[PDB]
Design an enzyme around this catalytic site. Structure first.
Site, short mmCIF file in Angstrom:
data_model
loop_
_atom_site.label_atom_id
_atom_site.label_comp_id
_atom_site.label_asym_id
_atom_site.label_seq_id
_atom_site.Cartn_x
_atom_site.Cartn_y
_atom_site.Cartn_z
N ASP A 1 -7.20 4.36 4.97
CA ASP A 1 -7.81 5.12 3.88
C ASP A 1 -7.34 6.57 3.86
OD1 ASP A 1 -9.23 2.77 3.36
OD2 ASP A 1 -11.13 3.51 4.19
N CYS B 1 0.37 3.61 -6.48
CA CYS B 1 -0.80 3.58 -5.61
C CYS B 1 -2.02 3.93 -6.45
CB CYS B 1 -0.63 4.52 -4.42
SG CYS B 1 0.08 6.14 -4.85
N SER B 2 -2.65 5.07 -6.15
CA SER B 2 -3.75 5.58 -6.97
C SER B 2 -3.18 6.59 -7.97
CB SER B 2 -4.84 6.21 -6.09
OG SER B 2 -4.30 7.23 -5.22
N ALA B 3 -2.79 7.77 -7.47
CA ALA B 3 -2.14 8.75 -8.31
C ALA B 3 -0.65 8.48 -8.50
CB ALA B 3 -2.34 10.16 -7.73
N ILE C 1 1.94 9.27 -6.34
CA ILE C 1 2.84 10.32 -5.87
C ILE C 1 2.89 10.42 -4.34
CG2 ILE C 1 2.51 11.60 -8.01
CD1 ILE C 1 0.69 13.58 -6.51
N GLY C 2 1.81 10.07 -3.64
CA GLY C 2 1.83 10.20 -2.19
C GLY C 2 2.34 8.98 -1.44
N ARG C 3 1.50 7.96 -1.35
CA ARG C 3 1.95 6.68 -0.83
C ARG C 3 3.15 6.18 -1.62
NH1 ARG C 3 -4.36 5.18 0.78
NH2 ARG C 3 -4.01 3.13 -0.18
#
Ligand SMILES: CC1(N)CCN(c2cnc3c(-c4cccc(Cl)c4F)n[nH]c3n2)CC1
Length: 496
Positions: free
Chosen positions: A396, A430-432, A434-436
């Site tokens: 998480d 992923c969610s946004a 950009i990170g994962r």
């Protein structure tokens, strides 16, 4: 510019800095995935906490953003949008500029003359430069440049004393600069001319991050000393101010409801444009997604909202994508990250003009595979198989402690994609997005370089990230994702 970020000041030094050297509306940002925005207001200093676990910069009492620069650019323009607990507005008005050179690509601190010479001659071209601590004169600095067209005498290396007198910098005459950066910037735009005509052009910093993949593990050790990763990562972050590209379409009123996070938006110049929309929708050409061309291509996108599921399948269909990579659960920490946009196993659903069938699922340890059939309703001959690779074990917060599961997952994804001739870009979300997502994409890009050329090639982790970040905001969010990228490429190299 991004001078408002000070990489190594305490909160006390921040307060004294705004109180003595600032005015009301002055602000800065500082570290310690925790960051603080320190803002002066009514002769008092407030501190606002910024959190990043891997997905976005979450500003307390503000919004979620792709990069600190985009966060600061937003509040400097929108305004009235940064309030406190009371509810009085906190205006960001004046950057309080940092003088540190620690996050400049050209500052190498401790380093001798011949050391710089050996680097500038093995890695530099005409205009390559660096700044270093003068050894002979403690307290001073040295600008070392290369100029020229081997050992043909056609190239040379020039040094130039930078005197440091009362916290100001100069090159022997002329103006006295408030920081090494201001001096470099000045003599980059107004190059220094030698007596006999040679022009000392500061064209590009000496590159220090390009490594030979075979020596990967040696650099991870060099970077794990005292941490070097942090120094390298924050120097990349310092370059984010060059990527403030326009994101106008994502800001239009018709498109607002199509964005998972209000201010995490696709660059206009790489966004996926959707054609073939019905004329009744005023704007039917928009999805929060960008093409990522390495320089196999990718599409990086947010997790579906209920009102963009139809647009997501128009994108998959239009782009001829055959592989989708999901790196989130539907829900995490009780918060929706991505609506289920695929049918249950064996079922068949219509998403607008698009029809999808879940043919079969396959569970692995770290991930589930969904074999989907996508077609346009109306003409059955448009059917193609889209393979959804759903990674489920990503923590998480932060990153996995071992890259093994991710690598095995990515090898599968690569093999399936390589097996379909003329497959479009690989969709990664992923969610946004950009990170994962950025982390997965950059690992795949690096490993592809190594799978084609073997361990006897060059790879440059920060430069690759910068290239990817110029096509979607904030790709790769945190220092821990950065270290994971290194650790994954180290692990892949040693499985060969
Ligand atoms: C001691 C230091 N101040 C000096 C050198 N050094 C570097 C040097 N180059 C880069 C980069 C980079 C590479 C390529 C493109 C872009 Cl755009 C980058 F931003 N990222 N991080 C870096 N760190 C470590 C810290």
């Amino acid at each position: 510019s991004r001078r408002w970020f000070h990489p190594n000041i305490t909160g006390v030094e921040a307060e004294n800095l705004l109180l003595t050297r600032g005015v009301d509306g002055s602000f800065l940002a500082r570290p310690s995935g925790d960051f603080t925005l320190s803002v002066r207001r009514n002769g008092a200093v407030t501190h606002i906490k910024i959190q990043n676990t891997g997905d976005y910069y979450d500003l307390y009492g503000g919004e979620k953003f792709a990069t600190l620069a985009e966060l600061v650019q937003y509040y400097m323009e929108h305004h009235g949008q940064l309030k406190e607990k009371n509810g009085d507005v906190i205006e960001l008005k004046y950057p309080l500029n940092c003088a540190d050179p620690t996050s400049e690509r050209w500052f190498h601190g401790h380093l001798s003359g011949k050391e710089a010479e050996k680097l500038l001659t093995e890695k530099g071209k005409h205009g390559s430069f660096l700044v270093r601590e003068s050894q002979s004169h403690p307290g001073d600095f040295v600008l070392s440049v290369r100029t020229g067209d081997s050992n043909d005498g056609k190239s040379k290396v020039t040094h130039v004393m930078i005197r440091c007198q009362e916290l100001k910098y100069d090159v022997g005459g002329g103006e006295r600069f408030d920081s090494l950066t201001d001096l470099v910037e000045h003599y980059k735009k107004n190059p220094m001319v030698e007596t006999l005509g040679t022009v000392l052009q500061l064209k590009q910093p000496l590159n220090t991050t390009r490594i030979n993949a075979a020596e990967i593990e040696s650099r991870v050790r060099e970077l794990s000393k005292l941490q070097g990763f942090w120094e390298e990562f924050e120097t990349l972050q310092q370059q984010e101010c060059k990527l403030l590209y326009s994101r106008k379409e994502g800001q239009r009123q018709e498109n607002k409801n199509k964005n998972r996070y209000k201010n995490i938006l696709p660059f206009d110049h790489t966004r996926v444009v959707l054609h073939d929309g019905d004329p009744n929708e005023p704007v039917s050409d928009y999805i929060n997604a960008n093409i990522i061309m390495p320089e196999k291509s990718y599409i990086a996108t947010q997790g579906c909202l209920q009102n963009t599921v139809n647009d997501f399948w128009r994108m998959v269909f239009q782009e001829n994508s055959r592989v989708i990579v999901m790196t989130t659960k539907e829900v995490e920490r009780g918060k929706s990250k991505c609506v289920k946009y695929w049918p249950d196993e064996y079922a068949l659903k219509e998403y607008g003009v698009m029809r999808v069938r879940n043919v079969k699922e396959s569970a692995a340890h770290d991930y589930t595979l969904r074999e989907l059939k996508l077609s346009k309703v109306g003409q059955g001959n448009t059917e193609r198989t889209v393979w959804q690779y759903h990674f489920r074990t990503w923590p998480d917060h932060g990153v996995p402690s071992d890259p093994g599961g991710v690598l095995d997952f990515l090898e599968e994804v690569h093999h399936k994609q390589e097996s379909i001739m003329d497959a479009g870009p690989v969709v990664v979300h992923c969610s946004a997005g950009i990170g994962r997502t950025g982390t997965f994409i950059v690992i795949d890009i690096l490993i592809d370089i190594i799978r084609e050329k073997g361990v006897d090639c060059d790879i440059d982790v920060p430069k690759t990230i910068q290239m990817v970040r110029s096509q979607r905001s904030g790709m790769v969010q945190t220092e821990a994702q950065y270290r994971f990228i290194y650790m994954a490429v180290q692990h892949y190299i040693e499985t060969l």
